Amino acid sequence: IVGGYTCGANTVPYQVSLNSGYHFCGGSLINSQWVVSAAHCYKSGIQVRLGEDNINVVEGNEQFISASKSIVHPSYNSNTLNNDIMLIKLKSAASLNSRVASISLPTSCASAGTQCLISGWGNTKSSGTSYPDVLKCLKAPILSDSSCKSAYPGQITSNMFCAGYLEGGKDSCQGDSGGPVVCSGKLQGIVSWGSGCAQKNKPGVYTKVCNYVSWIKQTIASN
Numbered sequence: 001i002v003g004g005y006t007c008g009a010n011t012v013p014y015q016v017s018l019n020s021g022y023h024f025c026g027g028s029l030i031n032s033q034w035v036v037s038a039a040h041c042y043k044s045g046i047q048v049r050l051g052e053d054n055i056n057v058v059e060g061n062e063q064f065i066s067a068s069k070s071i072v073h074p075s076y077n078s079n080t081l082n083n084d085i086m087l088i089k090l091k092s093a094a095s096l097n098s099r100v101a102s103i104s105l106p107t108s109c110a111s112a113g114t115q116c117l118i119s120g121w122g123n124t125k126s127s128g129t130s131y132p133d134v135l136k137c138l139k140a141p142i143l144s145d146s147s148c149k150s151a152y153p154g155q156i157t158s159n160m161f162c163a164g165y166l167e168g169g170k171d172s173c174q175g176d177s178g179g180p181v182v183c184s185g186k187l188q189g190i191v192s193w194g195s196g197c198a199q200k201n202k203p204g205v206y207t208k209v210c211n212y213v214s215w216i217k218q219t220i221a222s223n
């Protein structure tokens with residue numbers, strides 16, 4: 001997250017870190033046994049880390065649970081990042097309390113202009129590299145589909161939306177991928193891609209979760 005703020009320990013209780021010896025992506029807990037992330041975060045043999053604030057220090061609310069199964073969306077295209085969504089099942093159920101909690105799936109798609117909370121452990125610099133240890137947060141609006149497509153001609157599908165600031169300065173970034181965009185208390189987006197970070201007229205691009213609720217629910221119901 002570039003231009004954000006320190007969230008506070010366990011203030012984003014559905015935020016998880018995907019760990020394969022090191023943090024490499026975010027994700028969102030959507031029930032006690034399932035995490036939703038980006039398909040471009042796929043890799044074998046990872047551990048899901050819940051209850052994290054400082055990802056390099058054991059602070060006493062962590063739950064570490066290995067993944068039993070990954071399911072990349074059946075139509076994921078890594079060249080275009082169309083359908084950049086994946087489900088991760090945990091080997092055991094997380095224990096849910098105020099500091100570890102699931103985030104509700106949307107019942108409708110959030111409109112441009114809705115303010116949302118974006119969070120992750122990704123890069124905090126737009127020209128340079130500095131990775132934070134504690135979770136960072138950004139409050140940012142969904143941008144119109146027209147400004148999204150004008151910023152990224154030929155690249156925005158109906159499974160994507162833009163959020164952030166066309167003037168730059170505030171954005172998600174590398175290492176935030178797979179993490180949440182939460183609006184009015186529901187999971188509306190997944191940190192997916194963008195050109196650089198916090199650049200002018202290159203806002204963040206997010207997987208449009210509301211398109212995938214039927215697939216998520218049916219998948220969870222059979223796996």
Ligand SMILES: [Ca+2]
Nearest residue numbers: 054057058059
């Ligand atoms: Ca920790």
